[PDB]
Amino acid sequence: LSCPEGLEELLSAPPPDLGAQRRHGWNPKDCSENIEVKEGGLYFERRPVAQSTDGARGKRGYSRGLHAWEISWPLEQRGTHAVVGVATALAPLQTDHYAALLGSNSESWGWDIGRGKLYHQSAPQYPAGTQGEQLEVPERLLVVLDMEEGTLGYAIGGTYLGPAFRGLKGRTLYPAVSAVWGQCQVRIRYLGERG
């Protein structure tokens, strides 16, 4: 079990209420001009814009403890580049072409849930020693940020897939995605903190 200490307890707790999910949800003040944050942070909608990759950060950056949130991203709303992970407050959230914007720099770490590749200033396959064409990330995935070990990993159907990224200790990291699909609806559900 490569699971962060306390992940089972965090997931077994009463989930954060709607207020908390909104406080830790997408930031309307920290997203691409082509993204509209909906329901006070619970999801965003990318506007139908040609030749654009558009990202969003969570309202809250984490520097300590164990944090987890579920992303819900419908399979038919992913297009060519659907990347899920974290960013510093300095990651660019918009570019004028279709690309894996999340993880294309020093300020972001992303899992391409289409191709299964890991991007940081960039790619290895995740999970460990799988083939991309041989995997399909379902609609809901858990993002697991352990700021005690300085790790980012993912869980699918409540199974942790191990650490995707290491070396994160001493950073302040925000939930993030970058998207290319017009009118995609990407849900974030904060599941809480331990610590």
Swiss-Prot record:
Pathway: Protein modification; protein ubiquitination
Annotated localization: Cytoplasm; Cytoplasm, Cytosol
Keyword terms of this UniProt record: Cytoplasm, Host-virus interaction, Ubl conjugation pathway
Any one Gene Ontology molecular-function term assigned to this protein's record: ubiquitin-like ligase-substrate adaptor activity
Cellular component, GO annotation: cytosol; SCF ubiquitin ligase complex
A biological process term (GO) from this entry: proteasome-mediated ubiquitin-dependent protein catabolic process
Cytoplasm as UniProt keyword: yes
Domain B30.2/SPRY: 4-194
Family: Belongs to the SPSB family.
Role summary: Substrate recognition component of a SCF-like ECS (Elongin BC-CUL2/5-SOCS-box protein) E3 ubiquitin-protein ligase complex which mediates the ubiquitination and subsequent proteasomal degradation of target proteins. Negatively regulates nitric oxide (NO) production and limits cellular toxicity in activated macrophages by mediating the ubiquitination and proteasomal degradation of NOS2. Acts as a bridge which links NOS2 with the ECS E3 ubiquitin ligase complex components ELOC and CUL5.
Subunit structure and binding partners: Component of the probable ECS(SPSB2) E3 ubiquitin-protein ligase complex which contains CUL5, RNF7/RBX2, Elongin BC complex and SPSB2. Interacts with CUL5, RNF7, ELOB and ELOC. Interacts with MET. Interacts (via B30.2/SPRY domain) with PAWR; this interaction occurs in association with the Elongin BC complex. Interacts with NOS2.
Domain notes: The SOCS box domain mediates the interaction with the Elongin BC complex, an adapter module in different E3 ubiquitin ligase complexes. Essential for its ability to link NOS2 and the ECS E3 ubiquitin ligase complex components ELOC and CUL5.
Protein name per UniProt: SPRY domain-containing SOCS box protein 2
Protein's gene: SPSB2
Residues of the full protein shown: 23 to 220 of 263
